[PDB]
Structures are given as structure tokens and as C-alpha cells.
């Protein structure tokens, strides 16, 4: 309630599952859902100072639960990957288009 | 009468929409296009469809993993939609009739007496639906013995498919089967001579594009495939229903994917070197192309704005060679829609520009400075798209090496 | 048949496939969370007579 440029990015299914709970309905105006396999640019603008920083994030399916996705960041410090609670069978890592 | 006795005439023959498409169901249309493209045209240069129309035999990894995380679970569309299939093949006299026909065949050619009887019973729209369906299944199972006479059997199957009162609702397996049979028959006979066949084919195409959508991705791709091969075979006989497509890609809803169907239909139309618009419809050129270009403002789903940008670029490339007088207005609208989000989001702008300049290079000459400004600020695939936009216009640039040196091209 | 599922989400695959292969609808406490997901909502029910 004291900021305007900070948001919560997640899958659309995750947004639907999160806004249903009454305890988390205060995030209704601060959640930005992102489609999977769609490279989008995120602005890491500072609140106090007018400094800004752009980063590219890509959401990859995880196959864990409704709304579970991965996070593939690409910026100045190289490419990092966050596979939070994923599930992949053997021989499926070679089938992800966005990781190639 | 002899046929109405051995048929029920009262059983509601359930025809469900085929969901689990087999592997041969794709290669049959593949070979149909292979025959209708070279055996009857002799060109061997298949139409280059857009990225959204690129097809694979199996499904992508996201489709397979969607069974667990439901990535496509959120309802985005708004269209209203709904072996126990071959019950006609499980008829008492079905196999005996097929054996009889196969035996008697081998036991400008005109139809014999039995073929005349079959044609009189099938082509007549007053004959009950069950008898016509049985005759259609018999012709399907014995298409090899009907090919030398397929010039006569083209109209009955056409008017059976184009009929509003068919077996089931939607595009069921009987429709796709008879369509595949007719398109395999297109190598020798085409609905081009008799205007009745032309209007039958037009109504069939309208019916296909009317019920092309289906929430299941596989059957939706199959319907797009059958429409694609149908418009590829009968390219010189069909009038495209531009009014239906306009209503398809004009939804004006930022959080929906309804326009994707219309954009893909327009791309299928444009890939066969067809006009993107005909003034015969009630929609003028202004609002038509306006609603078409407005899809680039829907920056939520890529299948909407990226596909719209690509199909718009194809339309620009088409109207470029034909020297039409709407090229200036279309280019102005596209440049306006691009500059609208050039500075707001600047990440969908580069994607839309790369999709447009993929087929219409001369549009990047006004955004070259913008993409050179945005190049140092991009990462990942966005920088690659910007470099591709720079690549599409290299010979036209006066002096390029200084800009690349100033933009640290070597470390890139 | 009871299904002692500890996690809140992750077992919807089992529920949907059992419903599609048996025609019966699984009973859950809350299902309003899947109101915008038709492929999952039409497999769950609040009635206890299943
Ligand atoms: Mg987990």
C-alpha cells in the first residue's frame, strides 16, 4: 500500500488459484500473469530513485500442479534457471524449445 | 422398394466428433496435397505457411505436460461447442455389398446400370438420411472402384456434406472422411465445370470455417489441416467467405483468444496467393483492416498479436506486387500501431516488427533508428529479433558499419 | 473409495482421469477455485452422494 511499481508475476492458473483465497485477495491489483513460453521484459525500477533495470523472463511448464511453471531469467549477469518443484521424465529435457 | 426394407430409417445414428486422430489421418491429407500440387499442377513449390501454421506429427512438450499443470486450463476462448463410430460399417449387408461391388468391378466412361441406380438413390436429397449415409460409406469403402467414374460421384458427396441436415453436428468423422475421399479424387475430377459443384464447394467451405474451432488442440489442428488442404486443392473454384473471417478475428476483447482462429484462417487464405479482401461483402476496407490491425494491441497471448503481425506483413507483401492503392493506408496503420507501444512496452514492439519485416522488409526503414536504440537494452531472444530486423535491411542502408561499431557489435 | 491426498494441488490429474474413465465425479471440499477452468470443474462435485 506504499508502492506502485512492485508486482507479483506468476502463471495465470496460479493467479486464479491465489485470488480465490480471501486472505490473498489484496494482491488483486498487483499480480501480473505471464503466458508460458513467451519471453517478456520485466522492468526492475527502483521505488526511491528513478533507476531502472530490464530483465527477460520466460515461463516454462513444470508438470507438478495447476499453475506450476519454471523461471528462466536473462540479463547482464548471464542466464539463470529456477525449476521450483518440477517433474520431468528421462529424455524430456531435450524437448524444451526455450532451453535450446 | 428394396433398400428401405433392409434399413432402419428410424435410428438416430450418433456421429461423434473424432477426438483421437490417428497417424494415417495426417499422412492421407499430406499425400492428397502432394498429388494435387504436382500431379495436377506440376510446380513442386509448396506454399510457405506462417509460423502459427507450422505442424508437427506429435505434440509439443508443453502439450504433454499440460495434463499435470494445466497451462491451457484457464478458459480464454468464448465459442460455444460440444469403436462406436463405424456403426454403418457394422451393418448386416455392409460387407456383403462391398464384396459384391469389388467382385463385379473386376468381373468419359458412363455409369453402368447399377452405378446409375446408386447415383439415383444417393444424389436425391429426398431419400432418407440413413440410406444416403449407407451409400456414402459403401462408396468410401470401395473408392478404388469408383475412381474411374468419380466425375459423376463428386456432386452427391458434395451436396451430402454441404447439407445442413447431416448425420451429426459439427465436423464429424463422416464429413472428414468424405472430404478426404473427394480430395483424393481431385486428381482426375474437380468441381470447376458445373456451377452447382461450385456452390456446393462454397457452402462446404463455409460450413468448415463455421465449425472449425474445438477446445481440444489436436482436433482443432486437424480441422485447420483439412480446411488448408481443401483450399489448396480447390484453389481455382472457391470464393473465400471474408465476412465470416472478419467476424472471427474481430472480437475486441483484450483477454480472449477468439481472434486467433480468424487470424489463422486469414493466414491459410493468404498462403495460397489469394486476395486478402473482396469488396463484395458488407464490410468496407477501412474497418476490416482496422480491426485486423487492432489485434496487435492485444499483447497478452502471442498467438493473437504475433500472428496478426505476421499475417498483416504477408498482406503488405501481397499488395506490394499487385500495386494496390491501399498499401499506403495499411502501412500507416501498422506504423501507428507499432509506434504506439514502441515506447510503452518496447518488448512486444520488437516482436511485432520482426513478424512484419519477416515478409515485408521495406517497413523497417522507419524503425531502424528505434531498433538501433533498443539493441543495447535487449537480452535473450529479443536481441536476436532486433539483429534479425537489422539484417532484413542491410543493402538498403547507406553506411551501416558505424552504427554497429557504436553498438558494440564485436562483443555481441 | 477415499483418496487421502495430502497436498492441496497436484492430484487433479488423477481426479480428472478417474472421472473420465469411470463417469463418477470426485467429491472435494471447495471447487470454486476452478470456476474458470472448465476441464477440471466438470469433474468435481460438492455433493456427498458420489
Ligand atoms: Mg511442489
C-alpha–C-alpha distance, residues B260 and B58, integer Å: 22
Contact status, residue B260 vs residue B303, Cβ threshold 8 Å? yes
CB contact under 8 A, A16 and C32: no
Ligand 1 centroid distance, CA of A64 (Å):
6
Contact B377, A72 (CB under 8 A): no
The answer to whether B75 contacts C13, with C-beta atoms less than 8 Å apart, is: no
- Selecting from B301, B379, B381 the residue whose C-beta is nearest the C-beta of A35 gives B301
Q: Does C29 touch chain B (CB under 8 A)?
A: no
CB B184 within 8 A of CB B148: no
CB–CB contact B61 A40 (8 Å)? no
Q: Nearest chain B Cα to C16, which residue? A: B67
Inter-chain residue contact B61 with A92, CB threshold 8 Å: yes
What distances in angstroms separate CA A25 from CA A17, B133, B208, C32, C41, one per listed residue?
11, 56, 44, 14, 21
Q: Which partners does chain A have (≥3 C-beta pairs < 8 Å)?
A: B, C
> Does the beta-carbon distance from B61 to A95 stay under 8 Å?
yes
What spacing in Å lies between the alpha carbon of A84 and ligand 1's midpoint?
A: 7
Task: Provide φ and ψ at B229, rounded to 5°.
Answer: -70, -30
B67 lies within 8 A of chain C by CB? yes
User: Among residues A82, A85, A81, A55, which one has the least CA distance to residue A67?
Assistant: A85
DSSP labels, B335-396: HHHHHHHHTTTSSHHHHHHHHHTTT-GGGTTTTHHHHHHHGGG--THHHHHHHHHHHHSSSS
In B, which residues are within 8 Å of A92 by CB distance? 61
Report the alpha-carbon distance of residue B304 to residue B263 in Å, rounded. Answer: 7
Q: What is the dihedral angle through the alpha carbons of B184, B190, B191, B192, rounded to the nearest 10 degrees? A: 160
Cβ atoms < 10 Å from Cβ of B103: 10
Residue from C9, C10, C11, C12 to probe the interface with B (highest B Cβ count within 10 Å)? C12
Burial of B13 (0-12, 13-18, 19+ CB in 10 A): middle
Which cell numbers hold the place of B93? 449387408
Is there a contact between C40 and B70 if contact means CB atoms under 8 Å apart? yes
CA distance B230 to B183: 7
Resolution (A): 3.0
Amino acid at each position: 500500500e506504499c508502492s506502485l511499481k512492485v508486482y507479483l508475476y506468476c502463471s495465470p492458473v496460479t493467479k486464479e488459484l491465489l485470488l480465490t483465497s480471501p486472505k490473498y485477495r489484496f494482491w488483486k491489483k498487483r499480480i501480473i500473469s505471464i503466458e508460458i513460453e513467451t519471453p517478456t521484459q520485466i522492468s526492475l525500477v527502483d521505488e526511491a530513485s528513478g533507476e531502472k533495470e530490464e530483465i527477460v523472463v520466460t515461463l516454462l511448464p513444470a508438470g507438478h500442479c495447476p499453475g506450476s511453471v519454471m523461471f528462466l531469467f536473462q540479463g547482464n549477469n548471464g542466464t539463470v534457471l529456477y525449476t521450483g518443484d518440477f517433474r520431468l521424465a528421462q529424455g524430456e529435457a531435450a524437448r524444451m524449445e526455450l532451453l535450446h | 422398394l428394396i433398400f428401405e426394407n433392409l434399413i432402419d430409417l428410424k435410428r438416430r445414428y450418433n456421429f461423434p466428433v473424432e477426438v483421437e486422430v490417428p497417424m494415417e489421418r495426417k499422412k492421407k491429407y499430406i499425400e492428397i496435397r502432394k498429388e494435387a500440387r504436382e500431379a495436377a499442377n506440376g510446380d513442386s513449390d509448396g506454399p510457405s505457411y506462417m509460423s502459427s501454421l507450422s505442424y508437427l506429427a506429435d505434440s509439443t512438450l508443453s502439450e504433454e505436460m499440460s495434463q499435470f499443470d494445466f497451462s491451457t486450463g484457464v478458459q480464454s476462448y468464448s465459442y460455444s461447442s460440444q469403436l462406436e463410430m463405424d456403426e454403418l460399417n457394422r451393418h448386416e449387408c455392409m460387407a456383403p455389398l462391398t464384396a459384391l461391388v469389388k467382385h463385379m468391378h473386376r468381373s468419359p466412361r458412363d455409369l453402368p446400370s447399377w452405378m446409375k441406380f446408386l447415383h439415383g438413390k444417393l444424389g436425391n436429397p429426398i431419400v432418407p438420411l440413413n440410406i444416403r449415409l449407407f451409400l456414402a460409406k459403401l462408396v468410401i469403402n470401395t473408392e478404388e472402384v469408383f475412381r474411374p467414374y468419380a466425375k459423376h460421384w463428386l456432386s452427391p458427396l458434395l451436396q451430402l456434406a454441404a447439407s445442413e441436415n447431416n448425420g451429426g453436428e459439427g465436423i464429424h468423422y463422416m464429413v472428414v472422411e468424405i472430404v478426404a475421399t473427394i480430395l483424393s479424387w481431385t486428381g482426375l475430377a474437380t468441381p470447376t465445370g458445373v456451377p452447382k459443384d461450385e456452390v456446393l464447394a462454397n457452402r462446404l467451405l463455409n460450413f468448415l470455417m463455421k465449425h472449425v474451432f474445438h477446445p481440444k488442440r489436436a482436433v482443432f489442428r486437424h480441422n485447420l489441416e483439412i480446411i488448408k488442404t481443401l483450399v489448396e486443392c480447390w484453389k481455382d473454384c472457391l470464393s473465400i467467405p471474408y465476412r465470416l473471417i472478419f467476424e472471427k478475428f474481430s472480437g475486441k476483447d483484450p483477454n480472449s483468444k477468439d481472434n486467433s482462429v480468424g487470424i489463422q484462417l486469414l493466414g491459410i487464405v493468404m498462403a495460397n496467393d489469394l486476395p486478402p479482401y473482396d469488396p463484395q461483402c458488407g464490410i468496407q476496407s477501412s474497418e476490416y483492416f482496422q480491426a485486423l490491425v487492432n489485434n496487435m494491441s492485444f499483447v497478452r497471448y502471442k498467438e493473437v498479436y504475433a500472428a496478426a503481425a505476421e499475417v498483416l506483413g504477408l498482406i503488405l507483401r501481397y499488395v506490394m506486387e499487385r500495386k494496390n492503392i491501399l498499401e499506403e493506408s495499411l502501412c500507416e496503420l501498422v506504423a501507428k500501431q507499432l509506434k504506439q507501444h514502441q515506447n510503452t512496452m518496447e518488448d512486444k514492439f520488437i516482436v511485432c516488427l520482426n513478424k512484419v519485416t519477416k515478409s515485408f522488409p521495406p517497413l523497417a526503414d522507419r524503425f531502424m533508428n528505434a531498433v538501433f536504440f533498443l539493441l543495447p537494452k535487449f537480452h535473450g531472444v529479443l536481441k536476436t529479433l532486433c539483429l534479425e530486423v537489422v539484417l532484413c535491411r542491410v543493402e538498403g542502408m547507406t553506411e551501416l558499419y558505424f552504427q554497429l561499431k557504436s553498438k558494440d557489435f564485436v562483443q555481441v | 473409495v477415499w483418496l487421502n491426498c495430502k497436498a492441496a494441488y497436484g492430484y487433479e490429474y488423477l481426479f480428472t482421469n478417474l472421472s473420465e474413465e469411470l463417469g463418477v465425479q470426485v467429491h472435494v471440499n471447495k471447487l470454486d477455485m476452478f470456476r474458470n477452468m472448465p476441464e477440471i470443474l466438470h469433474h468435481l462435485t460438492t455433493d456427498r452422494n458420489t
